[PDB]
Ligand binder design. Sequence first.
Ligand SMILES: [K+]
Ligand SMILES: [K+]
Ligand SMILES: [K+]
Ligand SMILES: [K+]
Ligand SMILES: [K+]
Ligand SMILES: [Mg+2]
Ligand SMILES: [Mg+2]
Ligand SMILES: [Mg+2]
Ligand SMILES: [Mg+2]
Ligand SMILES: [Mg+2]
Ligand SMILES: [Mg+2]
Ligand SMILES: [Mg+2]
Ligand SMILES: [Mg+2]
Ligand SMILES: [Mg+2]
Ligand SMILES: [Mg+2]
Ligand SMILES: [Mg+2]
Ligand SMILES: [Mg+2]
Ligand SMILES: [Mg+2]
Ligand SMILES: [Mg+2]
Ligand SMILES: [Mg+2]
Ligand SMILES: [Mg+2]
Ligand SMILES: [Mg+2]
Ligand SMILES: [Mg+2]
Ligand SMILES: [Mg+2]
Ligand SMILES: [Mg+2]
Ligand SMILES: [Mg+2]
Ligand SMILES: [Mg+2]
Ligand SMILES: [Mg+2]
Lengths: 50, 114, 142
Amino acid sequence: RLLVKMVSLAKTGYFYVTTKNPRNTPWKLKLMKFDPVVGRHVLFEESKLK
Amino acid sequence: PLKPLVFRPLKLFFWATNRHVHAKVVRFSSPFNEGVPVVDISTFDAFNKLKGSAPVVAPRSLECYKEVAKMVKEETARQNINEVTLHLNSHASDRGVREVVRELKNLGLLVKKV
Amino acid sequence: QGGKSHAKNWGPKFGDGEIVFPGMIIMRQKQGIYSPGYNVGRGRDYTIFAKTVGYVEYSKLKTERGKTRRYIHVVPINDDWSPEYQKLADELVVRRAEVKRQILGHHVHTEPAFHFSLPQRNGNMSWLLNSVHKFPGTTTLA
RNA sequence: UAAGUCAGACGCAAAGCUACAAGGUUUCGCGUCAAAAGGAAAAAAGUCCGCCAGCGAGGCUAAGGUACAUAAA
RNA sequence: CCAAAGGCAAAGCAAACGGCAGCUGUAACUCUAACGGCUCUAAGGUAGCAAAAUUCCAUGGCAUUUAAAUGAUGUCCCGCAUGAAUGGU
RNA sequence: CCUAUGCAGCUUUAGGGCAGGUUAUUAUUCAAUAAACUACCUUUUUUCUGGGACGGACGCUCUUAUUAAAGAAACAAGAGUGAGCAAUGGUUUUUACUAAUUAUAAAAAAGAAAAGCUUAACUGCAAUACAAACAAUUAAAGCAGGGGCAUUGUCGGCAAUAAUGCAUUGAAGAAAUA
RNA sequence: CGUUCUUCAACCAACGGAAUAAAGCUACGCUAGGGAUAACAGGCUUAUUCGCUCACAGAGUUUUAUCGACGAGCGCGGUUGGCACCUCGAUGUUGGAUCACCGCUUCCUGUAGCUGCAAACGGUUAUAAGGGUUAGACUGUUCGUCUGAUAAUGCGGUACGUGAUCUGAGUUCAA
RNA sequence: UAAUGCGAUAAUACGCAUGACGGUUCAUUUUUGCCGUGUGUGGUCACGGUAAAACUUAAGAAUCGUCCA
Ligand SMILES: [K+]
Ligand SMILES: [K+]
Ligand SMILES: [K+]
Ligand SMILES: [K+]
Ligand SMILES: [K+]
Ligand SMILES: [Mg+2]
Ligand SMILES: [Mg+2]
Ligand SMILES: [Mg+2]
Ligand SMILES: [Mg+2]
Ligand SMILES: [Mg+2]
Ligand SMILES: [Mg+2]
Ligand SMILES: [Mg+2]
Ligand SMILES: [Mg+2]
Ligand SMILES: [Mg+2]
Ligand SMILES: [Mg+2]
Ligand SMILES: [Mg+2]
Ligand SMILES: [Mg+2]
Ligand SMILES: [Mg+2]
Ligand SMILES: [Mg+2]
Ligand SMILES: [Mg+2]
Ligand SMILES: [Mg+2]
Ligand SMILES: [Mg+2]
Ligand SMILES: [Mg+2]
Ligand SMILES: [Mg+2]
Ligand SMILES: [Mg+2]
Ligand SMILES: [Mg+2]
Ligand SMILES: [Mg+2]
Ligand SMILES: [Mg+2]
């Protein structure tokens, strides 16, 4: 298990923090979630939390 | 995960036996007092009606299930009842009961489970 | 060598005929020994709370499979189950706050009074600060 | 009272630990001592009766007593 | 015996500071093991001495000494934990 | 002998420093810097405990005795845990099913499995209560926005009871000033 | 350069975590305190130890002469323990020398029964505390082993009696 | 609750069919014991509880068996 950053693809800078298991799902996770900057659901992509 | 009980003034009840299906509509004022039945229709009444005009096989048949739904619709319409809540129990999953419920919804009566 | 876990107070909080107001906890339990009845709710940890103004009731039911079920009910003030009782409950809630403030006294303050105003977000009051503090309405356009 | 206190003790009644021991130890219910003079049991912190503002050569009682020591059959 | 961890030095130094093993089979009856097999380490304590100013079992076994010996002397000995310039006899 | 806001001397491969000598590098015709060796200076080396040392222990859950409200201690007793899951989350349909967990008489309009679509494991707030020295910790009706499955119900993660860490300091994304 | 919002990380597991980090010796020791807390003695307790009664199984083999058990109860305060009640502005340690008072659970000197008691020498039970209870080798010893005699060489309490009467061999300061 | 219940094609149009005997499963608080609290020289005391545990005789209901005395 690891902590990852889900970053908006709208380039607004908004992000979410979630937990993922890299071995069970060895691919970039993507989800639809609300973006307060824009005001609607958009597509988010996994990124390194650092 | 049982849900909390919700009080409703009008409820629909079904009693499925070996031989017939009974439907009742009862009005309540409070959970602590008895209700008043406003509609009482069973497949026994439908069988006596249809058999005279159109031969049917037995009371527990598709023809009688639709007939019971039609008779229930007329009584509720006459008394100005358009929305009812269904009481869910073991008998509610009977095939005969489910056919009656489907017919009622198509006729125009709004039946709600929750 | 020793040690003990922090105690959890399982058990009922009210008996038959006791008056409750919305949001009050009636039962704390680890498992669903008691089920929610009328005018009540249940939390994700089986905590039962009241949702209207009324009195607590207890009842037992025998199920189809021979098991025993126990319910918790809240009964309206005058056995009024009509849909108009909701507005009466809303007024009673406002009144109850006024009674408490009168009994407590003026020196038990119930609202803050700072030398500054709290920011507004999405039409409500927010406890989070803005990057810069400014006086309201002391600036003109351009 | 933004004060003092955070060393407690035993009796009757229960449970854990000890050996259904300790005037042992750890919790718990009531009482007394601590901070409580006076009376009864020999002396008597914790048992029984009972709570001292002062004086008096008046009277009735409690626990306990009523052939001598020692007040009363 | 200079391996490891340090110090010093000309990449070497122990009379510098320090270290110096274990299991198992075997000779007529028996016993013992001269003699074999295996593991590991930088090296595996050699001579000498030894119930000691060093010995837990302990007042060890034997001899001398006394009428009587937890004493003294001699002697047997892998010695819990002796030992060669912190020197051995 | 034990207990201190304890003191002192001594030792070292306990922490930090360079301020004499040696050594290394560099520069001017007795100098400057130092993770080295010697000398010197300064600082640290818990508590609980049937006395102290030795041993053991320190967070958070379940269960046993002190009966059938709650609460309740001992270096009393019997067991767990410092996670896992991209579905094992959310929501609809079907039925020859009603289990399992560290432990446990949870649960039938409920669950498990099978089939389909999904990301509410959200943004901004919140009446009223449980508990509680305080800090924090626990449950939650309801309002606005954008969504999922249904077609007017539910979703603010997981049957429930453990899977944790204040402030400070540091770092990243965005925005407002200067 | 500074502020707010969305977030995360390290040592805090002695887990309310901070003086950034960080081990020992003292018998050469020193000061401030406690019988709130140990070592010797007293006290409480009696598991253990010791004694008696019931039990009469089993050995002896007619005898409960004598020996003796499973198990249970009661008593003693002398053995090994438990507790921490008195004393830390101080209750001098072990053994012996010298001089003692008391108990009886009797080693000798007494009295009365039984006996697997012919006599002698014994065994065992009840009762009895006036007198007596040895000189030496080894060992700091208590104890223990041994030697020559003796009617016999008993046990225990008394701050495990006794240092303002003596001793200092052991233990327990500085080499 | 005969518009019941059960069934071996189990579906319900067809089969068994509501009585009678037998065996199983579920009132003077039945009245004694026992337990809890208060008081107590350790019981010649008081009240309550047992729908927590032992303990009586019925009557009824739910299946089941049955050519029926
Ligand atoms: K030397
Ligand atoms: K002790
Ligand atoms: K700490
Ligand atoms: K003292
Ligand atoms: K004698
Ligand atoms: Mg967020
Ligand atoms: Mg633990
Ligand atoms: Mg304190
Ligand atoms: Mg205290
Ligand atoms: Mg005590
Ligand atoms: Mg005092
Ligand atoms: Mg009188
Ligand atoms: Mg007189
Ligand atoms: Mg030597
Ligand atoms: Mg020499
Ligand atoms: Mg300590
Ligand atoms: Mg608080
Ligand atoms: Mg919706
Ligand atoms: Mg949920
Ligand atoms: Mg701290
Ligand atoms: Mg001193
Ligand atoms: Mg004391
Ligand atoms: Mg004490
Ligand atoms: Mg005698
Ligand atoms: Mg003596
Ligand atoms: Mg003495
Ligand atoms: Mg003297
Ligand atoms: Mg010395």
